[PDB]
Amino acid sequence: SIEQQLTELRTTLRHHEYLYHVMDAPEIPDAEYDRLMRELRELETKHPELITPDSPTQRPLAAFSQIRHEVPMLSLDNVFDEESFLAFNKRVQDRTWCCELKLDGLAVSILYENGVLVSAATRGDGTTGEDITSNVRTIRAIPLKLHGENIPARLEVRGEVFLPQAGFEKINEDARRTGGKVFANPRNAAAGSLRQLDPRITAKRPLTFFCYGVGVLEGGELPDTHLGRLLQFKKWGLPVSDRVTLCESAEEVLAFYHKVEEDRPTLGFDIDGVVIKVNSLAQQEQLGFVARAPRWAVAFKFPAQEQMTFVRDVEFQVGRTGAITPVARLEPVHVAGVLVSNATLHNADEIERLGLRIGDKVVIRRAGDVIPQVVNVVLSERPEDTREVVFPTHCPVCGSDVERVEGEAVARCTGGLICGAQRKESLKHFVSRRAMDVDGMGDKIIDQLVEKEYVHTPADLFKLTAGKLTGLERMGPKSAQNVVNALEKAKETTFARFLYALGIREVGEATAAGLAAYFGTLEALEAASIEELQKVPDVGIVVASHVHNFFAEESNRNVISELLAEGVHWPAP
DNA sequence: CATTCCGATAGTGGGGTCGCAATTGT
DNA sequence: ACAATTGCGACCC
DNA sequence: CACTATCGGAATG
Ligand SMILES: NC(=O)c1cc2cc(Br)c(C(F)(F)F)nc2nc1N
Ligand SMILES: [Zn+2]
């Protein structure tokens, strides 16, 4: 019953608050609480007459919980120049543009139920995000209540939370006065603001919001035009950029891009491109989505700001597949709002292309306004003393022979199971967000688990007890029990995540999804010949043979039978 | 047909902010 | 002792 | 978050 449903929710919420007052605790540390507050708002908005004056929603810091988005929040593929846009355009035609500023903030999804704001979440991994409702409620530009006609029963508004330049500078002024923490740039400051435990701190940071999209939608009368939906949003009280434009050709899109580039300094806030999307919702549904991103939109980026620094060293790091990746250690320099000290160098071939020597002066940028990249050596400034970058012929960790197969770029450690670096990075991978998802298990504790020889394969993680853990460096009684707990909860996975977690060569997230959908179960998968494997969409000789060799080797079957015995499971399909 | 091209994925890599709890300090 | 500082890892881009 | 070497399969002559 719904009367029964409300009291049950209200009673546990007031239990939590009473436990909190009585322990004079610094916060309700249980994620249950923010979740139950969400469940109770939903139910109460759904039955507005049954709301009581002293209901917990009518009003204690609480730990952040999570929100699943049935409609994924994905990424945008990038284009960096006019010719790449044209190739985007042709790809669309071959399978009207609404043109928008790409606000530099973070993505937030806000669920209104019957027009009443009920939750807000971050993107997370696309499916599951952080519940940040309490922080979002504080944002002046986001209404608690929609107003107007044909408001849908359920409307999930997607948008960008950002901090304008005057608000960023305001907060840094406050920090400088009161000896507080000074922020590096508006993008990373906006993300931080939204993750405060304490909504009252978020409230003093002048975050604003612009809508760009819809998630779930049930009821209402929205048009089939995306701009049309953005104008409806605005009729309902939601903030929408004054700059959303319709373009009828690729040439008009290019003029929009150049005009926004020219006007960038006058906007009052930061942006990192424009977003170009298929305006028609029915043309968007026909174009669909790749694993990572829609086929009907790109981000068209502006050129990234460059700076000069010099390379102090080049180190070679060992990956889980044995890959040896060079990394430049740079003299720290500021670039577009952040301190850059490192950049990948990809491979031996790239180093040769740059003709990079240790000591060289280099041009550096944040690729796509994010990730350090080395552009080129400045040869005319090369110092009298520089040193040759020698690629490792022996694994810097375990000592084994490095092998590079004829005509391929990547050089590997041949140590396999004896390599500690490989051991460590296979576990970091096993445990990662998109695989087994074990909270708390990062590089340091994995580094010790392996160094101390406590874990040899993944099933060993499930045997660790809190006592075994407490004794480690930077571990203790509470963090030990948190890890045993996380490991317990992570046993319930999915067939795809499990396949992904094993680190079969060439089998990453999308290919694991693929084998899982096709084979249904692990025994089918295990019994496949190289030939039935090649039937799976996007599985070819190379993937077939890795999948086959892997399941063929008893060690690998035992890893799995062991993880199965430690209690790892997923739903029968 | 062999060959080249291209869409998409796998497997690497970066910096900032902040919560929790280990540790240091008082 | 408990209070301040800070290592680590989650999570934003 | 990006780069891009690679894979698998579609386009070319
Ligand atoms: N950062 C931005 O301002 C922005 C981000 C978007 C992300 C996605 Br995913 C989309 C999609 F169209 F795919 F939903 N649109 C967007 N539009 C925008 N203006
Ligand atoms: Zn090695």
Distances (CA, A) of A364 to A73, A79, A111: 31, 20, 41
Method by which this entry was solved? X-ray
Compute the distance from residue A455 Cα to the ligand 2 centre, in Å: 17
Q: Are residues A336 and A250 in the same domain?
A: no
Q: Are residues A523 and A486 in the same domain?
A: no
Resolution as reported, in Å = 1.9
Q: Are residues A462 and A519 in the same domain?
A: no
What does chain A come to in residues?
573
Q: Are residues A257 and A206 in the same domain?
A: no
Q: Are residues A111 and A231 in the same domain?
A: yes
Query: How big is the CA angle at A327 (ends A324 and A329), to the nearest 5 degrees?
Result: 150
Q: Are residues A433 and A505 in the same domain?
A: no
Which residue has the CA at smallest separation from atom 16 of ligand 1? Answer: A212
Distance of CA A365 to the CA centre of its chain: 22
Is A65:A34 a contact under the CB 8 Å cutoff? yes
Distance CA A80, CA A299 (A): 8
Distances (CA, A) of A105 to A66, A125, A193: 20, 17, 11
CATH code where residue A517 lies: 1.10.150.20
CATH code where residue A312 lies: 2.40.50.140
Which of A266, A286, A303 is the last residue in one of the domains? A303
Helix or strand (DSSP H, E) at A314:
strand A306-318
CATH code where residue A153 lies: 3.30.470.30
Instruction: Find, among A473, A466, A419, the residue nearest to A442 by Cα.
Output: A473
Helix or strand (DSSP H, E) at A541:
helix A541-552
How many Å does it take to go from CA A340 to C1' B14? Answer: 8
Is A280:A96 a contact under the CB 8 Å cutoff? yes
CATH code where residue A295 lies: 3.30.1490.70
Q: Are residues A98 and A245 in the same domain?
A: yes
Q: Are residues A424 and A453 in the same domain?
A: yes
Is A296:A356 a contact under the CB 8 Å cutoff? no
Instruction: Find, among A9, A255, A262, A233, the residue nearest to A115 by Cα.
Output: A233
Which of A240, A266, A293 is the last residue in one of the domains? A240
Helix or strand (DSSP H, E) at A253:
helix A250-263
Distance CA A193, CA A137 (A): 13
Q: Are residues A133 and A233 in the same domain?
A: yes
Distance CA A541, CA A237 (A): 55
Q: Are residues A227 and A125 in the same domain?
A: yes
Which of A259, A283, A303 is the last residue in one of the domains? A303
Instruction: Find, among A415, A417, A472, A413, the residue nearest to A441 by Cα.
Output: A472
Compute the distance from residue A489 Cα to the ligand 1 centre, in Å: 33
Which residue has the CA at smallest separation from atom 14 of ligand 1? Answer: A213
Is A225:A279 a contact under the CB 8 Å cutoff? yes
Q: How would you classify residue A485: left for phi > 0, otherwise alpha for psi between -120 and 50, otherwise beta?
A: alpha
Domain that holds residue A393: 378-418
Dmax over CA atoms of chain A, in Å, equals 82
Q: Are residues A177 and A283 in the same domain?
A: no
Domain total for chain A? 7
Q: Are residues A110 and A198 in the same domain?
A: yes
A156 CB within 6 A, ligand 1: no
Helix, strand, coil content of chain A in percent (nearest 5): 40, 25, 40
